[PDB]
Design a protein around this nucleic acid. Structure first.
Ligand code: MG
Ligand code: MG
Ligand code: MG
Ligand code: MG
Ligand code: MG
Ligand code: MG
Ligand code: MG
Ligand code: MG
Ligand code: MG
Ligand code: MG
Ligand code: MG
Ligand code: MG
Ligand code: MG
Ligand code: MG
Ligand code: MG
Ligand code: MG
Ligand code: MG
Ligand code: MG
Ligand code: MG
Ligand code: MG
Ligand code: MG
Ligand code: MG
Ligand code: MG
Ligand code: MG
Ligand code: MG
Ligand code: MG
Ligand code: MG
Ligand code: MG
Ligand code: MG
Ligand code: MG
Ligand code: MG
Ligand code: MG
Ligand code: MG
Ligand code: MG
Ligand code: MG
Ligand code: MG
Ligand code: MG
Ligand code: MG
Ligand code: MG
Ligand code: MG
Ligand code: MG
Ligand code: MG
Ligand code: MG
Ligand code: MG
Ligand code: MG
Ligand code: MG
Ligand code: MG
Ligand code: MG
Ligand code: MG
Ligand code: MG
Ligand code: MG
Ligand code: MG
Ligand code: MG
Ligand code: MG
Ligand code: MG
Ligand code: MG
Ligand code: MG
Ligand code: MG
Ligand code: MG
Ligand code: MG
Ligand code: MG
Ligand code: MG
Ligand code: MG
Ligand code: MG
Ligand code: MG
Ligand code: MG
Ligand code: MG
Ligand code: MG
Ligand code: MG
Lengths: 155, 208
RNA sequence: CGCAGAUAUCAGGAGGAACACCGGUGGCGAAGGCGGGUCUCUGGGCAGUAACUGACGCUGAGGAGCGAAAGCGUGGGGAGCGAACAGGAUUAGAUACCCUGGUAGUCCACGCCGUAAACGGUGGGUACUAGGUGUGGGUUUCCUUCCUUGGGAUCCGUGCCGUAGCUAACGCAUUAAGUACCCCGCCUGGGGAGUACGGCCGCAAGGCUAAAACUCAAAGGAAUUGACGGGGGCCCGCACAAGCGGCGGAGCAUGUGGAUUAAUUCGAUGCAACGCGAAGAACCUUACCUGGGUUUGACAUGCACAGGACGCCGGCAGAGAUGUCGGUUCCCUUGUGGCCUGUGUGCAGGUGGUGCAUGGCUGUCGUCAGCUCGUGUCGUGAGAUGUUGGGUUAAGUCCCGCAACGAGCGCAACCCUUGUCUCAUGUUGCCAGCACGUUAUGGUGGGGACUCGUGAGAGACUGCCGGGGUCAACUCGGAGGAAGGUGGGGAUGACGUCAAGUCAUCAUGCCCCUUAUGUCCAGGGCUUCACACAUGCUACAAUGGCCGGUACAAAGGGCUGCGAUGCCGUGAGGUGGAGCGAAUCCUUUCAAAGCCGGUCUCAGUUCGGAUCGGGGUCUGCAACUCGACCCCGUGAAGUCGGAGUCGCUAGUAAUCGCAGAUCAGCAACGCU
RNA sequence: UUUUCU
């Protein structure tokens, strides 16, 4: 990245529904590079969430991402032999990407015995505001507003 | 490693094979006999510089062509060395063996024989300084040749150390494939051990 | 230090030191030093008139005085600051750098000591030697407003840059380290030593004059290139940042360390050795250890004495070599050639040593862009310019002025592959369009209309346009095009550094054995382990284990080798053997993941498979140490992992397969 | 911040 900003790939859109968020989700959950397996699992879990909630899967996914997307983050910095943290604003695109990342992370590490149903249930919990993703967002915002004091560094 | 031999690097473009023959079943025996006879000839003939040895095989008949500095001792006026070589090949069981002598045009326009001469001068009594001076001057005098580089490695003057010295003049574009480079290598003997001499010669350019 | 009333703020009072803005490379004094204001006394300096004296001038050993801060004696005052000393915090140790407290002292009056890098490191006086450029003071003359750094002439003080000259160089330059004269001190190699004794001064601290023995063969002053920096400036790399998956916890396979053994043959030892030299250790390879033979010898050659035998196919003894016997015996031709059995003669023979002697080959700095020479010029000399500054690029690639003018190794190109098109081209390869098949598919007669495989040519050159640019390099954007600004990946290691690896590839100088460290064979070893490290596969379960159906590629190997169909085995494999020196016959119609259907509802698990027992196949004369494969029983550790640490920026990271190198048998999870 | 020795 020394020369300058590198070009960004033209990510494709999902033809099944019409939202590239599905493509982003499948790419993020790609494990061992099994595209067909990942997409079929994602579609099955989406249908499970749809039949569980009785609403529009796209609308509920939009609600979940809107609820969980942060706006402020924390960056580490050490000056004068001491380590400090500074809060820095984040672009909404990166906020959405990291929200998807946390969604995957907390859809990986719970004990519902079946991840196909469990990812749907995690989506419902995040939409309802009882999810581990929203808990993590709460913690991140709390840290950022606690370290607000050191914002003078501006980096 | 520092440099790959220009001969091997440029085989496919400028220089041609100095041996041509086809075989796959008796290929092992054929290569054994060729490498043998080559080594035996090399260890047998030392007085007269031999530039290259090329062998062509057609079924049973084999033809060997020899380039040497001067034919006086390579072939006798009655055929002394010729008959000795024939008897040698017959002992090696070359089947039908035919001998030809080809004479170089410019004695000091090529790497092998200048290397032989420099090695002999270094070995007997001559100092490497004068050796390089005379070799470079003689190589330059010929108009066709343009660039010459001579390198000597080993013990020089009997000192208990290794001196790596090279002298350069003219063209030495080994990276440029189009260029024409001639490569030679021989070992000079002495009381204290062995000395290796390497020389590079550039001769024009080829297009086509 | 406070919650007994702090910090903070408003009013008032007490007391000590020093004076910001003027204020400066400015002024004054001999040097130290000197600035809040008013008053009293006092020194010195410069300009002019030139009235007066009439050589009265410089210098200066001893001598006298002044003389920064620190310290001492006597007596006061003590706001702030603060040696010594207490504590707090870091460090392995802090008697310091950081912090909270604080006694001399810093002040005043009276006497003391008389020392500094008291440096402009350059004494005082006198007369002379091109200028330009600021600053303070005093007089004069003219554009003339006669205001005014308008300008002209002169004395003194203070800065900078500059010729002749001097200087070893740095440098000086009318305020000389320049040309000249008078006066005074100083020193003659470094330590010993400004030290000992004596003397003088002083209350003390202490200061002033200043020796000798001994010991060294250097000590120091200038300047040039490298190297170095926890110096600065300007830039690049998976170096960091955002991401992916890993190593370090379990099992197994290789290599090493460390310990045994008679041997575990030797070498390599951070980067740059550690799935190394071992692309295939039961004999061989091995050179290690025991034991049995051996002798100019297992194997070559020239000189004398003995000859036509040597060379070979078999029985007997033996751990084997080997010893003894059965069957053949010279090809030339008189000189002997070929060959070698017994004596030696030289000498063969050594993986015995020496990569600190070497040849050749190889790894890293690094695919980094730097590294040189000819002439000239400058300085004395080691040397400098070219290779400096600005702009631009992936690059010493290029443009602009410059004592430089040119060239070289490097960089790009020329070489391979991959991206397209055109022409030539039809078999063992394909089928446009026609006929024969009739379940077997171009299989068969036929056919270049495209790939198919190998020959020739074109196509990327900022090719064109608009803006920035010194009208130049170079850069952004746009149209055509397969590709746009080296399209992608490759072959391709400039001078040198690491005394880097390799006498165990080969050859090579020297030493060593020769009756052995050479040589043949029988068994054993390199695979030993109470531990450690490095690289890989299996995982640690559902994105999954297992069962049935089911479609998609490449390339290469095959003669003493691949191996068809068929038959028997769960399967290792057993019989057999079409087609093949190979676009044809085999390596299955080259598959795995992929898609559909069923079980498992999270367990030490239907995941996971090592260890230990019972049965067979295959190659080999020879499977116990010590090979591989098939069947069964056996059911251990292991639930994403500690600080630390590694690869990866597009067909990239991850995941799943196929063929080959060494090879009868494999250590094959390694390599290509 | 701190960071010993060849
Ligand atoms: Mg090149
Ligand atoms: Mg107050
Ligand atoms: Mg002073
Ligand atoms: Mg006065
Ligand atoms: Mg008068
Ligand atoms: Mg006094
Ligand atoms: Mg005082
Ligand atoms: Mg005192
Ligand atoms: Mg006092
Ligand atoms: Mg007192
Ligand atoms: Mg007080
Ligand atoms: Mg303390
Ligand atoms: Mg203090
Ligand atoms: Mg204090
Ligand atoms: Mg002094
Ligand atoms: Mg003077
Ligand atoms: Mg002046
Ligand atoms: Mg001068
Ligand atoms: Mg002088
Ligand atoms: Mg000088
Ligand atoms: Mg000057
Ligand atoms: Mg002066
Ligand atoms: Mg002395
Ligand atoms: Mg002294
Ligand atoms: Mg003294
Ligand atoms: Mg005394
Ligand atoms: Mg010196
Ligand atoms: Mg010096
Ligand atoms: Mg430095
Ligand atoms: Mg890179
Ligand atoms: Mg990282
Ligand atoms: Mg691991
Ligand atoms: Mg491990
Ligand atoms: Mg291994
Ligand atoms: Mg070893
Ligand atoms: Mg290792
Ligand atoms: Mg190691
Ligand atoms: Mg390896
Ligand atoms: Mg052995
Ligand atoms: Mg062995
Ligand atoms: Mg050795
Ligand atoms: Mg060595
Ligand atoms: Mg370098
Ligand atoms: Mg000169
Ligand atoms: Mg220079
Ligand atoms: Mg230079
Ligand atoms: Mg230049
Ligand atoms: Mg340079
Ligand atoms: Mg260059
Ligand atoms: Mg056809
Ligand atoms: Mg180099
Ligand atoms: Mg070395
Ligand atoms: Mg060495
Ligand atoms: Mg030797
Ligand atoms: Mg040798
Ligand atoms: Mg020896
Ligand atoms: Mg021996
Ligand atoms: Mg043996
Ligand atoms: Mg071994
Ligand atoms: Mg595996
Ligand atoms: Mg069977
Ligand atoms: Mg199949
Ligand atoms: Mg198992
Ligand atoms: Mg098991
Ligand atoms: Mg398995
Ligand atoms: Mg476990
Ligand atoms: Mg578990
Ligand atoms: Mg860690
Ligand atoms: Mg094998």
């Amino acid at each position: 990245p020394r020369k300058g900003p590198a070009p960004k790939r033209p990510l494709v859109n999902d033809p099944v529904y019409g939202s590239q968020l599905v493509t982003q989700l499948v790419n993020k959950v790609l494990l061992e590079g099994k595209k067909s397996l990942a997409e079929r699992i994602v579609y099955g879990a989406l249908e499970q969430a749809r039949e569980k909630t009785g609403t529009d899967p796209v609308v509920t996914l939009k609600r979940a991402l809107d609820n969980v997307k942060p706006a402020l983050e924390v960056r580490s910095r050490r000056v004068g032999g001491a380590t400090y943290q500074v809060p820095v604003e984040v672009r909404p695109d990166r906020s959405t990407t990291l929200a998807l990342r946390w969604l995957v992370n907390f859809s990986r590490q719970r004990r519902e015995k079946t991840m196909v149903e469990r990812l749907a249930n995690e989506i419902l919990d995040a939409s309802n505001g009882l999810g581990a993703s929203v808990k993590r967002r709460e913690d991140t915002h709390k840290m950022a507003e606690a370290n607000r004091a050191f914002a003078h560094y501006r980096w | 490693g520092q440099k790959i031999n220009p001969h091997g690097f440029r085989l496919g473009i400028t220089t041609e094979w100095k041996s041509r023959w086809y075989a796959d079943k008796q290929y092992k025996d054929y290569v054994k006999e060729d490498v043998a006879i080559r080594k035996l000839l090399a260890t047998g003939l030392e007085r007269a510089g031999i530039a290259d040895v090329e062998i062509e095989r057609t079924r049973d008949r084999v033809r060997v062509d020899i380039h040497t500095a001067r034919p006086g001792i390579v072939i006798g006026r009655r055929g002394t060395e010729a008959d000795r070589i024939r008897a040698d090949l017959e002992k090696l069981t070359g089947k039908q063996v035919q001998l030809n002598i080809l004479e170089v045009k410019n004695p000091e326009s090529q790497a092998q024989l200048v290397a032989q001469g420099v090695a002999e001068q270094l070995s007997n009594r001559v100092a490497f300084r004068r050796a390089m001076r005379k070799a470079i001057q003689s190589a330059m005098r010929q108009p066709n040749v343009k660039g010459i580089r001579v390198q000597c490695s080993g013990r020089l003057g009997g000192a208990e150390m290794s001196r790596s010295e090279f002298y350069r003049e003219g063209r030495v574009p080994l990276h440029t494939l189009r260029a024409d480079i001639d490569y030679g290598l021989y070992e000079a003997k002495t009381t204290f051990g062995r000395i290796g001499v390497k020389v590079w010669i550039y001769k024009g350019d080829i297009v086509g």
